Copies of this chain bind each other. A is one copy, B any other.
């Protein structure tokens, strides 16, 4: 259970809950890495309402309308063309674009799926492989609790935490935290990903000794 439509903070008969299949994906991911590695198909879309369906001559009042596919994206390689209507994900019919998004947006990079297409009145079946992305996640604040600054995320296999983009007046960058750094350990403990990093911080040291790598050099950032 997550939220409720409700004027005057009082239940009115309308409540919402994230379905369990999403919890089972998003969750297992977190267990094994500390964050969710988001995969994308690489298509731009929009809800396929009845009006747009007339303009586009498609017998379907619901589904995901493909506005355009990105170059060198999974969808591109699979053969999805703009002006396509996605109507089903893995056998399952697709309520709308929002669901389709939430569905794959919950799957891990590399998952093998199959989309049900509808181009020019003809049914279509394609096989895709979720790929990388540019997911805006885990900010230096979600792991440091208060240290505004560059965003962070895992890196390749368990290769350590990477600092995405450092702002400017953000406290994190105010301790030598520069974008491009790769936290590979902390307080004499190896950091393969965000989970482990949060483990060292869990013990609550007085001084956090970050062992990051800038270019071809090993350096150390201190904290308190």
Q: A residues engaging B (CB < 8 A)?
A: 6-13, 44, 46, 49, 51-52, 54-57, 66-69, 71, 81-83, 187-188, 205-209, 211, 216-222, 224
Contacts and interface: CB of A to CB of B under 8 A. Distances in A.
Q: How many copies make up the complex?
A: 3
A193 B40 CA distance: 37
20 contacts: A6-B10, A7-B8, A8-B10, A10-B10, A44-B219, A49-B207, A51-B224, A52-B209, A55-B187, A55-B188, A55-B206, A56-B187, A56-B209, A67-B221, A68-B218, A68-B219, A68-B220, A71-B217, A81-B218, A83-B211
A77 to B, nearest CB: 14
B9 A7 contact: yes
A100 to B, nearest CB: 17
Given A55-B188, A67-B221, A82-B219, 9 more contacts: A7-B8, A7-B10, A10-B12, A52-B222, A55-B208, A56-B188, A67-B219, A68-B217, A83-B218
A71 B215 CA distance: 11
Contacts of A216: 71
Contact of A51 (B13, B68, B207): B207
Contact of A82 (B6, B66, B68, B220): B220
Nearest to A67: B220
B83 A220 contact: yes
The winner among A49, A55, A83, A219 for most chain B CB atoms within 10 A is: A55
Contacts of A69: 217
B8 A11 contact: no
B10 A207 contact: no
B12 A11 contact: yes
Nearest to A5: B10
Contacts of A66: 220
